[PDB]
C-alpha cells in the first residue's frame, strides 16, 4: 500500500533503478528454498519478473498495471507461474500459486474482450505478432503451452481460426463451390471462387489447409477401396502379382509418413521437455502416449504379420484371417480425421465418455443371464450333449432374445411329438429343430415357460430404460466440460495439418524426393513496420488505462460502499459535536 | 425441421460402422458364386435390416446346414439352404463370424439409440423457447394470405 | 499427544474468531450501527437548544 504513494507524486523511475540497487534488490533473498535453491544451481518488466517469482499478489498486479506491453505479459505470467508450481513440495504454496494465475488468466480475457469491440483488423493484427521481451515467440503459442482454457473459450479467437483455416483469400464460401473446384481445376481461374497472376493464383489456392485436408481424405477413401476388391475378388494362392505390390508399396509410403510425424515431434504445462532440443528417450516417451498413433501403429504391425504369413506357404488360410480383422482397425481410424470439422467436433468426443455405463449394463446382464442359461439346461436336459453343444445352448441362446428373436419350438412340448425314444424312465418328446438335441424331458414343463416370462420381463423392461436413464443424466452433465475440452484443441489440430506435405500419398515418393533433395510460416507470423507498431502499443494502453478505471468506479459506486461512507462522516460528526457541549 | 442437426451424425456415424463389417463378414466367408449386385447387397443391405429385428442365422453358422463338398479348392466346405447366400460358403474358423455379430449388435443397438435419444431430449428442451416465439410471429401472415 | 492437542486447539480458537468477524463486518449490522449512533448524536444535540 506503500508503493502507490511514494510514486505517484514522487520520484520518476528511470531515476530510481540503477543496475547497482537491482543487484541489491535481487540479493535480498527472503526466503531459503525456492530462489535459494534455483540459484544454488547459478524498467517495469524487471521489477514484474522479481515480483512473480517470490509470489508477491498485491505487488505483481500493481506491476503488471503499470506495464508496456499488456496481453502477452498476461499469459507468460500464467506460464511461469504453472511451470514454477511443480518444483516446491508444500501444498499451501500450490494453493496461492494455482489461484495467482487464474487471477492473471481472467485479467488477460477481459482485456482482449474489451479491445475486440473496436476495429477487428487491430486486434487480429496485435494477436498474431511477435513480442521481443520474451524471444521470437507469438501470443497465440504461449496460451497454447500453458493450457489456459478460457483464452481460447472465448469467441474472438475462433473467428481468427476460422480465417486462418479457410488460408489464403477466401471469406465463407459454401462447401459446393469448393467440390466443384477441386472436381475440375479450371474452375478456379474463373468467377466462382471467391478471393505473373495465374501461377500464384493457383500456389494460393492449394496452399489453404482446407484443400490439403480434402485431399488427404479423397487418398484414404481410395486406399480402403483398393484393399476392398483385393480381399474380396483376388489374394488366390498364386504369386501376388500387380495388384497386391501396388497395395505394398502404398503400406510402405504409410510406415514412411506415420515415421516422419512421430521423428519431428509437447506440453510445458506438464512438465515436458518443451521445443528445441529434446532425448530421443524422450521424444520416445512422448509419441506413445497418445492412444491414436499407438492403434496405428498396432494396425501396421498386424498387417505385417499378415502379409508375412502369406508369402510362406503351407499357412495360406490364416494371412486372410488376419488379415480381415485387421481391415476393421483401418476403417476405424476414419473417425479420428473428421475431429477438425466443425458440425462433429463436440460430438465424436463425448461418446468416449459415456464408457462408464455400458460396462455396467454388461456386468448385470452377464450375471443375470448365465442363471437362466443352467437352469434351462438343466430342466430339459438334453439327451445328446458334447462341449460346444452344451456351451452353445446356455450362452448364445439366451442373448438373442433381448433382440426380438424368440423361438419357441424348443422351449415347450405342446407343439412337438410325442415320441418315446429314450431308454432312462419317464416321458420325452422329439424336437423338431436342429442343435436341441433329440429328446427333451417333459417333467413339470411349465416351469420353463414361467421362467422365460421373467427373463423377458427383466431384461427388456428394466435395464433398457434405465440404461437411457443413466445415458441422459450423464450427458447433460459432461456437455458442458467436453465442449470446452473440444474448443481448447482445435489450433493443435490445425497446426499439424501444415506442416504436413503438400502432396497425396500417391505423390509422397516425389514429395519425400523433395524432402531428402536438401538434407511453420505461414499465419503464424506477422512483419510490421515500427511506426505501426508504435501507434497500435499506443491504441492498446488507451483501452486498458480506460478498462481499469471503468472497473474501479464501478466498484466504488456500488451499493455496499455508501453504507461505508455514511458510517464514518456520521461518526466525524459526531465526534466534532462532542466538543461544543 | 430444426432436429435435422442429429441424424446426420446418426448417418455418419453408422456408416462407418457398418461399412466395416459387411467387408469382414464377406471376407471371412468367401462366397464361391460372385457378381457385382449380389457382392454389393451381400455387405450392405443385409447388415442394414438387422438393426431392426431381423437377424437370419441360417448362412452365419455352419453347424444349421449340410456337410456338402461341391467346392474344388482345398479345405472344408458347406451348402447354404437360403437363396443369395452363393452356394458355398467355407468353414474355416467360423467362430469369428459369430464374435463379430456379437460386438456389432452390441454397438448398433445397445449404445447408439439410446445415445439419439438423449441427443434428441436434450436438443428440444432447449429450442422450444425459441421455436414458440417464431411460430407465434408468421401467424398474421399466415392469416392474411387466405 | 501433547503437541498435537495444541496444533488443533490452535485452529479452533482461529476458526470461531473468523467467523464470529465475518458476521461483524457484514451489511446488515453497519445499518445497526449507523441507527444506534445517529440515534446518540440526536440525544446529546438534544441538550444543546
Known sequence: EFVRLLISHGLSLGHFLTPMRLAQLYSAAPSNSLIRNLLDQAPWSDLLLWALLLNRAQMAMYFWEMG??????????????????????????????????????????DLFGECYRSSEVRAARLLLRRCPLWGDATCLQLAMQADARAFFAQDGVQSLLTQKWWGDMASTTPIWALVLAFFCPPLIYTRLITFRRCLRRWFHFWGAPVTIFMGNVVSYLLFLLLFSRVLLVDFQPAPPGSLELLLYFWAFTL??????QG?????????????????????????LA?????????????????????????????????????????????????TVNKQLGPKIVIVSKMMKDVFFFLFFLGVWLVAYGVATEGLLRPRDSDFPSILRRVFYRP???????????????????????????GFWAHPPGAQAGTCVSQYANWLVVLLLVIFLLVANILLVNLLIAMFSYTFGKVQGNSDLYWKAQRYRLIREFHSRPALAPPFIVISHLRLLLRQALEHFRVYLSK???????????????????????????????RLKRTSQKVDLALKQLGHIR
Open 68 to 109: 508496456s506491453n499488456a496481453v502477452s505479459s498476461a499469459l507468460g505470467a500464467c506460464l511461469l507461474l504453472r511451470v514454477m508450481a511443480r518444483l516446491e513440495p508444500d501444498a499451501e504454496e500450490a494453493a496461492r500459486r494455482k489461484d495467482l494465475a487464474f487471477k492473471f488468466e481472467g485479467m488477460g480475457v
Open 399 to 425: 442373448y438373442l432374445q433381448i433382440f426380438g428373436q424368440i423361438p419357441q419350438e424348443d422351449m415347450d412340448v405342446a407343439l412337438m411329438e410325442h415320441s418315446n425314444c429314450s431308454s432312462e424312465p
Open 255 to 260: 510406415l514412411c509418413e506415420e515415421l516422419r
Open 531 to 561: 511506426e505501426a507498431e508504435r501507434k497500435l502499443l499506443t491504441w492498446e494502453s488507451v483501452h486498458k488505462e480506460n478498462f481499469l478505471l471503468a472497473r474501479a468506479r464501478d466498484k466504488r459506486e456500488s451499493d455496499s460502499e
Open 290 to 338: 497418445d492412444s491414436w498413433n499407438q492403434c496405428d501403429l498396432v494396425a501396421l504391425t498386424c498387417f505385417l504379420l499378415g502379409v508375412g504369413c502369406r508369402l510362406t506357404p503351407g499357412l495360406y488360410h490364416l494371412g486372410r484371417t488376419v488379415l480381415c480383422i485387421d481391415f476393421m482397425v483401418f476403417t476405424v481410424r476414419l473417425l479420428h480425421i473428421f
Open 263 to 287: 521423428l519431428s515431434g509437447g506440453s510445458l504445462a506438464s512438465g515436458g521437455p518443451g521445443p528445441g532440443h529434446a532425448s530421443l528417450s524422450q521424444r520416445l516417451r512422448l509419441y
